[PDB]
Design a protein around this motif. Structure first.
Motif, short mmCIF file in Angstrom:
data_model
loop_
_atom_site.label_atom_id
_atom_site.label_comp_id
_atom_site.label_asym_id
_atom_site.label_seq_id
_atom_site.Cartn_x
_atom_site.Cartn_y
_atom_site.Cartn_z
N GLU A 174 0.80 -1.21 0.00
CA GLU A 174 0.00 0.00 0.00
C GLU A 174 0.84 1.27 0.00
O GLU A 174 0.31 2.36 -0.24
CB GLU A 174 -0.96 -0.02 1.20
N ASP A 175 2.14 1.15 0.25
CA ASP A 175 3.04 2.29 0.22
C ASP A 175 3.91 2.26 -1.03
O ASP A 175 4.95 1.60 -1.07
CB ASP A 175 3.91 2.31 1.45
N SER A 176 3.46 2.97 -2.06
CA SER A 176 4.13 2.93 -3.35
C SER A 176 5.49 3.59 -3.34
O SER A 176 6.25 3.40 -4.28
CB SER A 176 3.26 3.64 -4.39
N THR A 177 5.79 4.36 -2.29
CA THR A 177 7.01 5.17 -2.25
C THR A 177 8.24 4.45 -1.70
O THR A 177 9.36 4.94 -1.85
CB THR A 177 6.83 6.46 -1.40
N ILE A 178 8.04 3.30 -1.05
CA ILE A 178 9.12 2.56 -0.42
C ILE A 178 9.36 1.27 -1.19
O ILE A 178 8.49 0.39 -1.26
CB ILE A 178 8.83 2.31 1.08
N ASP A 179 10.56 1.16 -1.77
CA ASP A 179 10.92 0.01 -2.61
C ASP A 179 11.61 -1.12 -1.83
O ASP A 179 11.98 -2.14 -2.41
CB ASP A 179 11.83 0.44 -3.76
N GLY A 180 11.79 -0.92 -0.53
CA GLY A 180 12.44 -1.89 0.33
C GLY A 180 13.09 -1.19 1.50
O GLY A 180 12.92 0.02 1.69
N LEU A 181 13.79 -1.97 2.30
CA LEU A 181 14.48 -1.47 3.49
C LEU A 181 15.98 -1.74 3.39
O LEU A 181 16.41 -2.73 2.80
CB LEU A 181 13.94 -2.12 4.77
N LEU A 182 16.76 -0.86 4.01
CA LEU A 182 18.19 -1.09 4.17
C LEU A 182 18.49 -1.02 5.67
O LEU A 182 18.48 0.04 6.28
CB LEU A 182 19.01 -0.07 3.36
N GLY A 183 18.73 -2.19 6.26
CA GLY A 183 18.95 -2.29 7.69
C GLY A 183 20.32 -1.81 8.11
O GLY A 183 21.31 -2.13 7.46
#
Length: 330
Positions: A118-127
């Motif tokens: 539902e959040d089109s702006t976040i392509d993934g996470l970098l921990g």
């Protein structure tokens, strides 16, 4: 070596921040949520269940000449907000702001939960927490920072998050023009895999400072500031009409209010969060009830210095042999 990348709020409330990251050869640029509270670098990908992709940019490992499947490796993560994702793993070249790591584990999502879709702006996470939290099985993988560290001019990264504005993540150096006064360093426990530290107390508005130890984590991937119920009650008691709402899920306040600042201690130093940073806007479109940016940690099990707190400071994540955290005003 060093790197420097701009980080940008995803929306008008600073709900999260995205930073462009180059993955693969030729580069595929994805906008990732840099998260000092977790330790997986995972992306939407060509392998992600199609119905679970809605506007995100995807990593396609088959189009990267440097991608290699990490045979047998899988990952699966669940976050404090109840969201989750899982998949398989490639190694590939990853660059952030000019700093390049070869052989970085890039965790490719096969499944993501609804909030990610539902959040089109976040392509993934970098921990950017400690690699002991990384979920890859059967061979745990290192974070981008852990892989880069030995090559960096200094084994540090810094978070300089903006209020309703872009900011910066730097790797390998401290930009002495980016803060005022001095940086106060404080001890870190890595026992839970987090950048965990102890604040020396707090004040509400122009009130007197209360000296009290508050253990919590510096977590760029959490939006709000989560503190003990006693502290949070003391804050909201200074806002006429504020109340804790079980139906909404936290403290709300009249949108007509002017919020007081909140100060937290770092050793003998003090970081002041302006009142406006604590306003997260109407609970639903058109409502005159607004959601608070300071909430109780009761039942989380840990206090969280999320973006509301961190964006009021220039924050040094010192990954020396004995890690520490530094905070400066800015």
């Amino acid at each position: 070596s060093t790197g420097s990348a701009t980080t940008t709020p995803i929306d008008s409330l600073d709900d999260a921040y995205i930073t462009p990251v180059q993955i693969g050869t030729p580069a595929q640029t994805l906008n990732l949520d840099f998260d000092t509270g977790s330790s997986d670098l995972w992306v939407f990908s060509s392998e992600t269940t199609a119905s679970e992709v809605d506007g995100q940019t995807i990593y396609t490992p088959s189009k990267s000449t440097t991608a290699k499947l990490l045979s047998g490796a899988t990952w699966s993560i669940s976050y404090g907000d109840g969201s989750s994702s899982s998949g398989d793993v490639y190694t590939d070249t990853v660059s952030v702001g000019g700093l390049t790591v070869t052989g970085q584990a890039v965790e490719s999502a096969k499944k993501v939960s609804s909030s990610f879709t539902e959040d089109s702006t976040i392509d993934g996470l970098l921990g950017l927490a400690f690699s002991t939290l990384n979920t890859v099985s059967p061979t745990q993988q290192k974070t981008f920072f852990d892989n880069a560290k030995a090559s960096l001019d200094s084994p540090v990264f810094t978070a300089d998050l903006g209020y309703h504005a872009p900011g910066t993540y730097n790797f390998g150096f401290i930009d002495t023009t980016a803060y005022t006064g001095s940086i106060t360093y404080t001890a870190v426990s890595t026992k839970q895999g987090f950048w965990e530290w102890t604040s020396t107390g707090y004040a509400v508005g122009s009130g007197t400072f209360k000296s009290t130890s508050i253990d919590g984590i510096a977590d760029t991937g959490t939006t709000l500031l989560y503190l003990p119920a006693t502290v949070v009650s003391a804050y909201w008691a200074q806002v006429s009409g504020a109340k804790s709402s079980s139906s909404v899920g936290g403290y709300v306040f009249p949108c007509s209010a002017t919020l007081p600042s909140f100060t937290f201690g770092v050793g003998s130093a003090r970081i002041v969060i302006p009142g406006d940073y604590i306003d997260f806007g109407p609970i639903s479109t058109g409502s005159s009830s607004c959601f608070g940016g300071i909430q109780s940690s009761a039942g989380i099990g840990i206090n969280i210095f999320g973006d509301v707190a961190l964006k009021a400071a220039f924050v040094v994540f010192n990954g020396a042999t004995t890690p520490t955290l530094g905070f400066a005003s800015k």
